[PDB]
Structures are given as structure tokens and as C-alpha cells.
Amino acid sequence: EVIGRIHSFESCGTVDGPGIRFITFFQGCLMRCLYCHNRDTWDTHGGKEVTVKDLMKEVVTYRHFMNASGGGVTASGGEAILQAEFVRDWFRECKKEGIHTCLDTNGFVRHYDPVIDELLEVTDLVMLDLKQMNDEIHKNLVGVSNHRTLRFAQYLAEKNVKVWIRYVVVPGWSDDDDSAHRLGEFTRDMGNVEKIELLPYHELGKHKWVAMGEEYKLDGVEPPRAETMRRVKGILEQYGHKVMF
Ligand SMILES: C[S@@+](CC[C@H](N)C(=O)[O-])C[C@H]1O[C@@H](n2cnc3c(N)ncnc32)[C@H](O)[C@@H]1O
Ligand code: SF4
Numbered sequence: 060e061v062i063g064r065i066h067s068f069e070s071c072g073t074v075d076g077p078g079i080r081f082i083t084f085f086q087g088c089l090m091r092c093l094y095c096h097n098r099d100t101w102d103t104h105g106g107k108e109v110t111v112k113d114l115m116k117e118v119v120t121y122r123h124f125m126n127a128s129g130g131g132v133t134a135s136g137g138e139a140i141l142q143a144e145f146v147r148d149w150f151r152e153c154k155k156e157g158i159h160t161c162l163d164t165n166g167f168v169r170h171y172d173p174v175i176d177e178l179l180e181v182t183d184l185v186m187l188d189l190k191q192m193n194d195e196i197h198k199n200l201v202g203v204s205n206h207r208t209l210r211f212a213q214y215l216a217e218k219n220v221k222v223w224i225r226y227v228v229v230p231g232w233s234d235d236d237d238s239a240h241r242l243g244e245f246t247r248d249m250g251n252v253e254k255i256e257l258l259p260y261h262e263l264g265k266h267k268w269v270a271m272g273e274e275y276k277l278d279g280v281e282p283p284r285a286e287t288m289r290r291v292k293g294i295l296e297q298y299g300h301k302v303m304f
């Protein structure tokens with residue numbers, strides 16, 4: 060059986076509407092976001108080993124809180140798509156149970172092997188992070204280029220995969236007008252994008268960096284003002300998508 064490495068899993072009420080989301084936080088990430096609120100998910104060799112069978116035993120205990128009206132499973136992390144074969148197998152079993160599936164990903168897809176298409180076939184919703192359209196800023200904010208993520212966004216559009224875009228708004232890094240316009244331009248013709256969700260930066264998880272003995276590089280940065288969230292939202296709305304925060 061395929062072995063997955065997970066940081067943890069948790070059942071949580073959906074953000075809105077009834078029912079619950081069973082979220083598995085997969086272990087391992089290859090990005091280095093200065094704001095990462097889950098620094099302990101980076102190590103690919105850490106976490107706990109689990110089988111799909113093990114995980115489904117936990118999932119089915121919440122069956123009655125997952126329905127068409129609300130609820131399901133989410134693969135998050137960490138970067139779940141680094142373990143695409145396991146997530147595919149997991150989602151395949153969730154589909155046999157009639158459970159809604161959501162993939163929460165940074166889109167850092169480096170190999171387009173058949174497993175990716177197979178995963179998407181059993182993925183109902185992709186929540187895709189677009190962290191910065193300006194690659195010069197992206198490299199300084201995340202440690203890697205945004206090229207792979209942008210290619211994956213376009214791949215999802217070509218396959219008409221349902222997508223929510225998520226954009227973390229960080230003062231001094233991703234709150235400027237130009238970056239917002241770039242995001243609106245890039246996603247405008249993606250008819251598969253149901254909405255753009257703006258997430259205000261928060262300093263949760265700083266202690267996880269201190270535990271590793273590493274400097275948190277965004278000390279002193281505060282959450283964005285409501286005025287800033289409204290400005291970014293208004294810019295994005297000019298490009299025709301539903302924008303929310
Ligand atoms: C831990 S990552 C899990 C999924 C995947 N690793 C990713 O980033 O796309 C849940 C969401 O919160 C965002 N996030 C991470 N740190 C944050 C912070 N300090 N403030 C606000 N959002 C943050 C992530 O960008 C992602 O959109
Ligand atoms: S992609 Fe997600 S888990 Fe990975 S470093 Fe960035 S915020 Fe953290």
C-alpha cells in the first residue's frame with residue numbers, strides 16, 4: 060500500500076454552511092514562505108506514516124456531518140501534491156463513499172506524470188494559492204520562482220477544474236496595486252475560477268520558527284488594514300471575478 064506522511068489531521072466546521080471538513084495536513088513542503096504559519100510541515104521525512112485505510116477509518120467517523128449541503132475532506136499541509144499518488148488513492152476511496160474532496164495546494168508541480176490527471180479526476184475543488192504574480196517579489200517572499208505555480212494554474216483552466224484562488228495579503232510584500240492588477244489580469248479569462256479569496260496576513264505560527272532556531276523574517280509586520288483589503292479587492296473586481304475576504 061502507498062504510505063503517506065502526515066503532520067496531523069483534524070475535523071473542523073466548514074467556514075460557512077453546515078457540516079464539517081476533515082482536513083489532513085500532509086508533511087513536506089518545498090516552498091519557504093516568509094509568513095508560513097506551519098513551519099513544522101516543511102521536512103519531507105518527518106511526520107507520521109499512515110495508509111489510506113488508516114485515514115479512511117478516521118474519516119468515516121464524521122460521515123454524517125459530510126453531505127451535499129456541506130462538508131467533505133481536504134488535503135492540505137504542507138504541500139499535499141508532493142504526495143499525489145497517496146492523495147489520489149485517498150480521494151478515490153472518498154469518492155466510493157460519496158464524499159466531497161478538496162485539494163489545498165501551492166501548485167508547485169514539477170512533474171506532469173499521469174498521477175496528476177488521475178488526482179484531479181477525483182478532486183471536486185482545488186484551492187490554489189497564488190502568492191505573488193511579480194516573480195522578483197515571489198522569489199524573495201517564497202524562495203522559489205512562481206513559474207511552476209502559474210503553469211499549473213493554466214493547466215487547471217485547460218482541464219476546467221473548479222478552482223478558488225487564495226491570495227495572502229502581506230503589507231510591504233503583496234498589498235501593492237501593481238501586483239493586484241497582475242493577479243486580476245492573469246485569472247480574468249479562467250472561467251473555472253469560482254472566486255478569489257483574500258487572506259489577510261496574520262502572525263500565527265511564529266513560535267514554530269523559533270523552535271527551529273530560525274529567525275522569523277516578518278517581525279514587525281502587522282496585519283493589513285481593512286482599507287488595504289478593500290483596495291486590493293476593488294482592483295481585482297475590475298477583472299470580473301467574485302472577490303471575497
Ligand atoms: C500551510 S499552507 C497549506 C496549503 C499550501 N501549503 C499553501 O500554502 O498553499 C492554508 C492557507 O493559509 C495561508 N497562510 C500561510 N501562512 C499565513 C499567514 N501567516 N497569514 C495568512 N495566511 C497564511 C497559506 O498561504 C494557505 O493559503
Ligand atoms: S506553501 Fe504553504 S506550507 Fe509551504 S511554506 Fe508556503 S505557506 Fe508554508
Ligand SMILES: [K+]
Nearest residue numbers: 164186187188
Ligand atoms: K492553497
